[PDB]
Amino acid sequence: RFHSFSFYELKNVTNNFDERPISVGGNKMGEGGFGVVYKGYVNNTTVAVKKLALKQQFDQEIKVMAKCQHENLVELLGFSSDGDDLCLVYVYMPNGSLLDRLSCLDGTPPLSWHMRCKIAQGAANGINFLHENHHIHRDIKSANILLDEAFTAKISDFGLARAVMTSRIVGTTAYMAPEALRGEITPKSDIYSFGVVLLEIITGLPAVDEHREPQLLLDIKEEIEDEEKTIEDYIDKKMNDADSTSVEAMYSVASQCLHEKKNKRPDIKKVQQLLQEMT
Ligand SMILES: CN1C(=O)C[C@H]2CN([C@H]3CC[C@H](Nc4ncnc5[nH]cc(C6CCOCC6)c45)CC3)CC[C@H]21
Numbered sequence: 001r002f003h004s005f006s007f008y009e010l011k012n013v014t015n016n017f018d019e020r021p022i023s024v025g026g027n028k029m030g031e032g033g034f035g036v037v038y039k040g041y042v043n044n045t046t047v048a049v050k051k052l053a054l055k056q057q058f059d060q061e062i063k064v065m066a067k068c069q070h071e072n073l074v075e076l077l078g079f080s081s082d083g084d085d086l087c088l089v090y091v092y093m094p095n096g097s098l099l100d101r102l103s104c105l106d107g108t109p110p111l112s113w114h115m116r117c118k119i120a121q122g123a124a125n126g127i128n129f130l131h132e133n134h135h136i137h138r139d140i141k142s143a144n145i146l147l148d149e150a151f152t153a154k155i156s157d158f159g160l161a162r163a164v165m166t167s168r169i170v171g172t173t174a175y176m177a178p179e180a181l182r183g184e185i186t187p188k189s190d191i192y193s194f195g196v197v198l199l200e201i202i203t204g205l206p207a208v209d210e211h212r213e214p215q216l217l218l219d220i221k222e223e224i225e226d227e228e229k230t231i232e233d234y235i236d237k238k239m240n241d242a243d244s245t246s247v248e249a250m251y252s253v254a255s256q257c258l259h260e261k262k263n264k265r266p267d268i269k270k271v272q273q274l275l276q277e278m279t
Pocket of ligand 1: 020022028029030031037048050074091092093094096097100102137146156157
């Protein structure tokens, strides 16, 4: 079960939803398309409060969280629905997202290859649990992979999760599978998106960068296949412990995940198997 918070409780613990960033002495941690994330303090314990700015995504997040409890899934502590505002309270992840850590945001040291392998395994275990419980994430990306006090990967944002076609195409363009951009809902789309995440882990480069050539990361797969370059040329230079064999092993998994034809992609159980064999 989850704790039922009144809107006034979350108003006070976030210092009246202090929209200034943490760095300037505020409570704002960041923002997405569905809401602003604030740092909160409840009984000497730190929390993450997402104020939604939509009701179906609130209900879906609570529904999926109540059904799915796992080491590699972020934990929901509570919620608020009494006001005209909808809030979701989560366990605070001291090491933020995988995207922020790969970009060494706010002076954090680069993640070692060893830590990156454990994160990839953890994230695959998280997706596996969701698929075993007949749930499709629909928005797998490095920004949706959180890191706890031990750098354990925790898949987040189950607002777009589904228990097939759609008229409302949702997700992050740079990570989305071709059929997902076409309106299809399949667990194979989650596999493709995980393949993009694996490329981000190897390269330390975001999936999309408008001031970069090529703009999209999944295009490096084409340069490697056409023998124009190798994965060795793209290995994150911010690592000192990356070995050619295990990097090529993770790239092989990423390449299999990134097959344009959804039926040629491996299932999450096979992805999990190949990532364990890698280490
Ligand atoms: C502008 N920026 C900054 O000032 C710094 C930097 C951080 N930003 C993100 C903001 C949201 C955050 N999320 C969480 N951080 C800690 N503990 C958590 N527990 C549960 C969550 C989520 C919240 C959303 O719903 C799903 C569960 C969470 C991840 C980092 C990225 C951009 C950068």
